[PDB]
From a paper:
A periplasmic solute-binding protein (Smon0123) captures unsaturated GAG disaccharides with the 1,3-glycoside bond and delivers substrates to an [name] transporter localized in the cytoplasmic membrane. Smon0123 is composed of two major domains (N- and C-domains), and each domain has two small subdomains. Each domain included a parallel and an antiparallel β-sheet surrounded by many α-helices and formed the α/β sandwich structure. All the crystal structures of Smon0123 so far determined include metal ion in its molecule, suggesting that the metal ion contributes to protein folding.
Crystal structures of ligand-free Smon0123 (N-28/C-5) and ligand (CΔ4S or CΔ6S)-bound Smon0123 (N-18/C-5) were also determined by molecular replacement with CΔ0S-bound Smon0123 (N-18/C-5). Generally, the solute-binding protein adopts two conformations during substrate binding, substrate-free open form and substrate-bound closed form, indicating that there is a transitional state (substrate-bound open form) in the conformational change. Compared with the structure of CΔ0S-bound Smon0123 and that of ligand-free Smon0123, the N- and C-domains of ligand-bound Smon0123 were 47° more closed than those of ligand-free Smon0123. Distinct from substrate-free Smon0123 in the open conformation, the binding protein in complex with the substrate adopts the closed conformation by accommodating the substrate at the cleft between the N- and C-domains. Therefore, the closed conformation of substrate-bound Smon0123 is considered to be important for association with the [name] transporter. The substrate specificity of Smon0123 coincided with that of Smon0121-Smon0122(10xHis)/Smon0120-Smon0120 for ATPase activity, indicating that the [name] transporter interacts with substrate-bound Smon0123 (closed form), but not the substrate-free form, and triggers ATP hydrolysis.
Numbering used by the authors: 28 to 500
């Protein structure tokens, strides 16, 4: 059966002749025909153009789920929940076994309009983590800090005791990597168990920047900033911060993405003798040793349009990607080309792990149509199949110690509540970022100014936004 689809990902329209989709056609007898051409590169433009047709393609795939769900509410996509319950055993069991993932699939009106492209979140939750210069701790006779007060003592010693050995007070004890204010705050306030965004607490949704922990975080950060413990240029350096500070042997500690930050030991070993930037668990504050840095559960998804003539066959195509072999196909490519089975489990080939032109394993996989964002279920075993030893070590450490808290899910709103919420959320963001940056850099006094700042947030609509967020959760 020839089945029309709108599908794009990373600027490329899905080519059904790629090995992954030829295999799935051989297994399912569904042959996709894309309405997006090989010349289109702008998925937002091509999607909107596609929606002006009198007939929609059989399957509609898009990166932004809220747009798919609105198209469902408008009647352009059909509800899927009865189709799944009646005809898609793999999805039916997946939703039963994963109530969190089921939430991502249910739209604001209680219908399912799209199947998300899920990360394997419960197997790898891990994004950012805390790193510290083990070789500096050791040469200074310091324990690994395990609380925020112990970190303070540690960063003070980094700043005052010349661990890079050059007789200059040039050490930058704590730094971040960011290119906007929200990203700076994200990597500073999590240490103090605060949040710059919305979060979940005791089943309710709350606004990070209005909390007592945020006040305490900014006050402490302002104190550490004044004492030279936090990079004087936190808000002015950009994405070059980590490379500049680590490669010049100035930086002592950070909070940053685990896979990339764990690469510096191997890169700087010949250049900085003894260099060991080491991943540690989140520091404890008042009994809390969690981090709110977490991966997300999905990105994008796909649905069936009102114009598909055989939706039952299409829900089975959707279900194929949740079978054992369909999920392995999507994640790993073709057996005998991208991977072999070793004791029942895929092991990538040299074609994937040692591409002679320098291509990454994921880039090689993408070229066969693996990992092509639709409504499939990523497998963390695909990622561990190629990730570096230090990346995998960091993932395992944070996973085994259960330190990562689930992020607030992507919430669902009607179009009108969304506009209302976004207008409020945008206005408050501007206030929080202005005030927190100035407080951290030592302007004014947060104790004297906190109340008026909270009233400004309330005047911008904080209570209404809380009401909308809690309804949506
Ligand atoms: Ca020094």
């Amino acid at each position: 059966k020839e089945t029309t689809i709108f599908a794009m990902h990373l600027g490329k329209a899905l080519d059904p002749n790629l090995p992954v989709f030829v295999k799935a056609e051989k297994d399912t007898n569904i042959k996709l025909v894309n309405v997006a051409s090989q010349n289109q590169t702008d998925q937002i433009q091509a999607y909107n153009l596609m929606l002006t047709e009198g007939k929609l393609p059989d399957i509609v795939s898009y990166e932004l789920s809220a747009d798919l769900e609105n198209l469902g509410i408008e009647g352009g996509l059909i509800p899927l929940e009865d189709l799944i319950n009646q005809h898609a055993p793999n999805l039916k069991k997946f939703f039963e076994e994963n109530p969190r993932y089921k939430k991502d699939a249910v739209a604001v009106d209680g219908h399912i309009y799209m199947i998300p492209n899920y990360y394997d979140y419960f197997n790898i939750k891990v994004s950012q983590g805390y790193f510290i210069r083990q070789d500096w701790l050791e040469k200074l006779g310091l324990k690994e800090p395990r609380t925020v007060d112990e970190l303070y003592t540690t960063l003070k010693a980094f700043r005052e005791k010349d661990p890079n050995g050059n007789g200059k007070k040039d050490e930058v004890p704590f730094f971040v990597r960011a290119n906007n204010v929200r990203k700076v705050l994200t990597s500073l306030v999590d240490l103090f168990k605060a949040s710059p965004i919305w979060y979940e607490e005791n089943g309710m949704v709350k606004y990070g920047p209005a909390q007592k922990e945020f006040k305490h975080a900014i006050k402490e950060l302002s104190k550490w900033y004044k004492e030279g413990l936090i990079d004087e240029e936190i808000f002015t350096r950009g994405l070059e911060s980590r490379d500049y500070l680590l490669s010049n042997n100035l930086g002592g500690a950070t909070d940053d993405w685990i896979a990339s930050t764990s690469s510096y030991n191997r890169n700087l070993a010949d250049k900085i003798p003894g260099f060991n930037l080491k991943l540690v668990l989140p520091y404890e504050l008042n009994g809390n040793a969690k981090t709110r840095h977490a991966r997300t559960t999905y990105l994008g998804g796909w649905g069936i349009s009102k114009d598909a003539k055989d939706p039952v066959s299409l829900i089975k195509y959707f279900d194929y990607w949740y079978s054992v072999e369909g999920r392995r196909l999507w994640n790993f490519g073709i057996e005998g080309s991208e991977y072999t089975l070793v004791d029942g489990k895929p092991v990538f080939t040299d074609k994937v792990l040692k591409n002679p032109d320098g291509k990454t394993p994921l880039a090689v996989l993408r070229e066969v149509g693996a990992q092509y964002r639709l409504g499939a279920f990523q497998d963390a075993q695909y990622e561990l199949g190629w990730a570096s030893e230090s990346a995998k070590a960091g993932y395992k450490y944070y996973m085994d110690n259960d330190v990562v808290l689930d992020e607030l899910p992507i919430l669902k709103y009607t179009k009108e509540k969304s506009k209302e919420f976004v207008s409020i959320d945008t206005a408050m963001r501007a206030v929080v970022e202005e005030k927190a940056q100035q407080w951290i850099l030592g302007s004014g006094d947060i104790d004297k100014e906190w109340d008026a700042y909270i009233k400004r947030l309330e005047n911008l609509g904080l209570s209404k936004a809380e009401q909308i967020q809690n309804e949506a959760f």
